[PDB]
Amino acid sequence: FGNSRADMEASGGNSFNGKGGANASNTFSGTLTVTVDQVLANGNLHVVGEKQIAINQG
Amino acid sequence: NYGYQPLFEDRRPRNIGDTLTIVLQENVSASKSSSANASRDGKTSFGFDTVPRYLQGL
Numbered sequence: 425f426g427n428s429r430a431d432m433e434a435s436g437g438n439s440f441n442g443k444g445g446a447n448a449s450n451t452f453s454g455t456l457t458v459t460v461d462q463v464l465a466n467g468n469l470h471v472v473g474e475k476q477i478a479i480n481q482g
Numbered sequence: 483n484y485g486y487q488p489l490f491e492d493r494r495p496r497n498i499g500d501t502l503t504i505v506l507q508e509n510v511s512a513s514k515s516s517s518a519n520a521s522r523d524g525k526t527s528f529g530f531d532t533v534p535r536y537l538q539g540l
């Protein structure tokens with residue numbers, strides 16, 4: 425060890441960060457009167473309805 | 483429909499066309515952590531700064 429033959433110095437680093445996300449929301453707060461389309465074998469009713477409103481410009 | 487229908491039962495779906503209501507209310511959460519460390523430190527010294535006449539040889 426007379427010289428710096430044994431003198432040693434070293435550093436090392438490794439950092440990793442990963443992220444991920446997702447969202448999906450929906451809301452509906454109306455009331456619509458529909459009409460029966462047909463009666464199924466079990467008695468369930470197929471209902472279809474439509475409502476058109478022309479407030480102004482569309 | 484001529485099928486038999488119970489009166490006091492909870493009207494669960496029973497056939498192909500029957501409809502059921504599903505409340506998702508799904509909530510899953512998983513976490514994982516790990517750590518490790520290792521530290522070693524050493525430091526040695528020795529010095530006279532004054533040597534006896536009889537020990538000057540060594």
Ligand SMILES: CCCCCCCCCCCCCCCC(=O)O[C@H](CCCCCCCCCCC)CC(=O)N[C@H]1[C@@H](OP(=O)(O)O)O[C@H](CO[C@@H]2O[C@H](CO)[C@@H](OP(=O)(O)O)[C@H](OC(=O)C[C@@H](CCCCCCCCCCC)OC(=O)CCCCCCCCCCCCC)[C@H]2NC(=O)C[C@@H](CCCCCCCCCCC)OC(=O)CCCCCCCCCCC)[C@@H](O)[C@@H]1OC(=O)C[C@H](O)CCCCCCCCCCC
Binds near residue numbers: 536537538539540
């Ligand atoms: C687990 C235990 C197992 C057992 C282990 C056994 C011991 C394991 C070994 C431990 C000892 C280390 C050996 C060092 C010398 C050596 O071999 O390894 C060197 C390289 C290093 C390798 C070591 C790795 C080990 C690896 C580790 C292994 C560990 C296990 C090579 C070398 O040789 N390099 C060499 C070279 O350099 P260069 O390359 O550049 O040319 O030349 C230059 C110039 O020479 C000088 O010039 C001077 C004038 O100018 C001149 O003075 P002058 O009067 O003439 O004016 C002067 O003469 C003089 O001292 C004059 C006179 C002084 C008398 C004063 C009274 C002192 C009493 C002091 C009493 C000591 C008390 C213990 O002498 C002596 O009687 C020395 C005393 C002998 C004691 C015997 C023990 C009896 C048991 C007594 C028992 C007591 C019971 C209670 C000249 N000195 C010399 O020649 C050198 C040598 C001459 C040998 C001839 C004498 C008979 C030897 C006879 C036999 C010796 C055999 C060993 O003396 C020594 O030290 C020898 C020390 C031995 C101690 C062993 C203890 C055993 C316990 C027994 C235990 C079992 C030197 O400086 C240089 O040496 C130096 O620097 C050395 C420095 O000083 C001293 C530092 C010591 C610090 C502790 C180590 C710390 C190191 C730690 C880190 C690793």
Ligand SMILES: O=C(O)[C@H]1C[C@@H](O)[C@@H](O)[C@@H]([C@H](O)CO)O1
């Ligand atoms: O004993 C040796 O082998 C050495 C001692 C140092 O001086 C080293 O650096 C080398 C040098 O390169 C010679 O020129 O020689």
